[PDB]
C-alpha cells in the first residue's frame, strides 16, 4: 500500500530521456565487476569469452523519498522506467545479457536517490594476439567499456575500492592459458563526436607448453634422431639406406601438417614453424649426404669411407647446437 504510493509518486512527472543533473554537473557512476569465468581463447578468431556481474551506482536527485524504508529492493520491472546509463563495451564482438528465467537484473534505490543497477553479461571481447613466440607467448587481453553518447562533460565513470573480484580462479575454462593477474586503468578517448571516459581491465595470459612437447617437439626430434641411423649402416646397403632416407622425409611431412592446425594463417615465421622447418632440413640433408657418398664409392672409395665418419659427428653436433640456440633465445633472452 504505502510502498505503492512511494513508487507512483517517484514516477510522476519523471522523464527518462534526461540524465540526472542534465545541465548542472557530470553524472558520476561507480562501476564494479565480478568475473565468473573466462571461456576459451579463440586463437584463430583472436577473441575470448568472459562472464561477469556488472554493477553500476550513481545518484539521482529525482528519486528521493521520505518514509520509514531505507532501501527499496525492486526487480527488473522498474529498469525500463528510470534513467539508465548507456554503457557499452568498445572492443566486444558479440555480447548478450541473460534472460532465463527472467531478465537477470536488479535495481535497489535508497532514500537519498542512490541507485544500484546490476546485470549479468557474457562478452566475446577482441584480443589481438602476437604469435611470434608460439607456443611460448604471453598476452594481455583487455576489456574496455565507456558511454556511447555522453561525452566527458556529462557522464564520468570511476572505479570503486574493490573494482574487480574473481571467485574460484582454478574453476575457469582456461586450459590452454594460465591467468596471471589483472590490472585496471582509466583514460580519455577522443573521437569525432567528443571525449569519452574509458575504463579498461587487462587480463594477462600465458600459454602452456605441455601439449606441444608431446605433440610436436618430441615426435619431430625422434624422426631427426632416427634419420641419423643411416650413417651407422654399411654403405653397401643401397636399398636399406635409401628406403630409410626417403621414408623419414615422408614421416616428417606427415608431422608438419599438425603444427599449425591450432593457429590462424599468420604470415611470419613462428617459433613452431621454425623448429619444424629446421627438422625437415635435417632429414633432407641426411639423404642428400648419402647420394654424395654413393657416387664417390665408384671413383674414390677412400674418400667415401671418411665421409660417413664426419657425418656421424657433424650432424648430431649441428642439431644439438641448434637446440641450444633455439631454446635460449625463446626462454631467456626473450
Amino acid at each position: 500500500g504505502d510502498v505503492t504510493v512511494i513508487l507512483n509518486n517517484l514516477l510522476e512527472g519523471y522523464d527518462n530521456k534526461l540524465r540526472p543533473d542534465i545541465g548542472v554537473k557530470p553524472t558520476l557512476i561507480h562501476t564494479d565487476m565480478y568475473v565468473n569465468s573466462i571461456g576459451p581463447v579463440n586463437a584463430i578468431n583472436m577473441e575470448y569469452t568472459i562472464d561477469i556481474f556488472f554493477a553500476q551506482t550513481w545518484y539521482d536527485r529525482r528519486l528521493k523519498f521520505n518514509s520509514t524504508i531505507k532501501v527499496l529492493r525492486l526487480n527488473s520491472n522498474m529498469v525500463g522506467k528510470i534513467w539508465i546509463p548507456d554503457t557499452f563495451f568498445r572492443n566486444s564482438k558479440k555480447a548478450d545479457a541473460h534472460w532465463i528465467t527472467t531478465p537477470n537484473r536488479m535495481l535497489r534505490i535508497w532514500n537519498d536517490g542512490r541507485v544500484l543497477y546490476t546485470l549479468r553479461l557474457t562478452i566475446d571481447a577482441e584480443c589481438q594476439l602476437q604469435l611470434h613466440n608460439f607456443p611460448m607467448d604471453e598476452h594481455s587481453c583487455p576489456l574496455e567499456f565507456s558511454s556511447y553518447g555522453y561525452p566527458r562533460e556529462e557522464i564520468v565513470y570511476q572505479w570503486k575500492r574493490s573494482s574487480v573480484e574473481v571467485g574460484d580462479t582454478r574453476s575457469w575454462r582456461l586450459y590452454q592459458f594460465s591467468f596471471v593477474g589483472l590490472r585496471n586503468t582509466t583514460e580519455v578517448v577522443k573521437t569525432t563526436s567528443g571525449d569519452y571516459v574509458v575504463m579498461s581491465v587487462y587480463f594477462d595470459l600465458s600459454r602452456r607448453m605441455g601439449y606441444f612437447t608431446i605433440q610436436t617437439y618430441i615426435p619431430c626430434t625422434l624422426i631427426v634422431v632416427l634419420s641419423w641411423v643411416s650413417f651407422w649402416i654399411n654403405k653397401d646397403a643401397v636399398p636399406a639406406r635409401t628406403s630409410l632416407g626417403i621414408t623419414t622425409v615422408l614421416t616428417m611431412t606427415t608431422l608438419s601438417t599438425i603444427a599449425r592446425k591450432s593457429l590462424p594463417k599468420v604470415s611470419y615465421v613462428t617459433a613452431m614453424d621454425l623448429f619444424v622447418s629446421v627438422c625437415f632440413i635435417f632429414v633432407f640433408s641426411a639423404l642428400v649426404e648419402y647420394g654424395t657418398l654413393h657416387y664417390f664409392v665408384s671413383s674414390q672409395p677412400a674418400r667415401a669411407a671418411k665421409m660417413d665418419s664426419y657425418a656421424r659427428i657433424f650432424f648430431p653436433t649441428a642439431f644439438c647446437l641448434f637446440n641450444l640456440v633455439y631454446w635460449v633465445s625463446y626462454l631467456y633472452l626473450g
Binding site: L226, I233, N234, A237, A240, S243, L244, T247
Partner: peptide
C-alpha cells in the same frame, strides 16, 4: 638388411 630397415621405419 633391407627387410629389417623397411620393417622398422
Amino acid at each position: 638388411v633391407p627387410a629389417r630397415t623397411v620393417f622398422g621405419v
